[PDB]
Amino acid sequence: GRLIYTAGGYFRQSLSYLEAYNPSNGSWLRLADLQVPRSGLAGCVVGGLLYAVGGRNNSPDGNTDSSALDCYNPMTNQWSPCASMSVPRNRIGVGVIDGHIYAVGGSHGCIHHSSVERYEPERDEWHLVAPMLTRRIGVGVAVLNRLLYAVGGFDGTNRLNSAECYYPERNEWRMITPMNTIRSGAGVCVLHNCIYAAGGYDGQDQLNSVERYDVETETWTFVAPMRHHRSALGITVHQGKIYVLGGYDGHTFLDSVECYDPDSDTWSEVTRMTSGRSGVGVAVTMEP
């Protein structure tokens, strides 16, 4: 069976929690902690292994941005360090294409990156690829049809409604149609033939709106809004439904987990996280 893993996050300080939710029975399991606490990281899976990429440890003793890549194996319940990226990347976005991890954007102190690098698990090596056309932190990343999309974020001065796509065989980024809403800290995922952008912050308020990009029509369309406004949420897809986890709503660190059913265009509350937090990394893999 497959579980939704949530790694890290923030509540009072950056966290080292690894917890896994089972949609089939509503259970939560607490698994091995990350070796270093981190929030603003991203999670992904390659070959049944869970990876935690980038982030920052915002601790009582200071703020340290992370260039780390760590790998969790559900068969052993152990984390192992991998090669680190070229630079630290807080509020990074990641996508997997053909067994390789692409790390996009993020910040290191006041530096807002446009750089992008790609990890090859078989060689344990990272290499830089073409940078994005825009610097983006708090960027949402998703993969559809072996193309990588970077959506929204913050460029160091303005929050963005823009988005762009990377075409690996041409090592080139191109702008796509911008979203109808400015969003930094949105959750971005893919479902069917669309890229969804949920929540985030528009410069004034945390959002409950959700829009999707149809890659054939090049248009963005709003779908049903989430019940809760949220920014710095985790997101993933499991058995044809989108799950959003936690986040910050300007008042509370949410423990709410909502699930979108695209056939009925409705969101429902399915479980609560064990404690409220923002800036988690999320991905789906086998039970431990």
């Binding site: 910050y248 300007g250 660190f253 923002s278």
Partner: peptide
Amino acid sequence: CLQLDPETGECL
């Protein structure tokens, strides 16, 4: 408050 990042909630 404006000591928090409004996107993430983190203390600045």
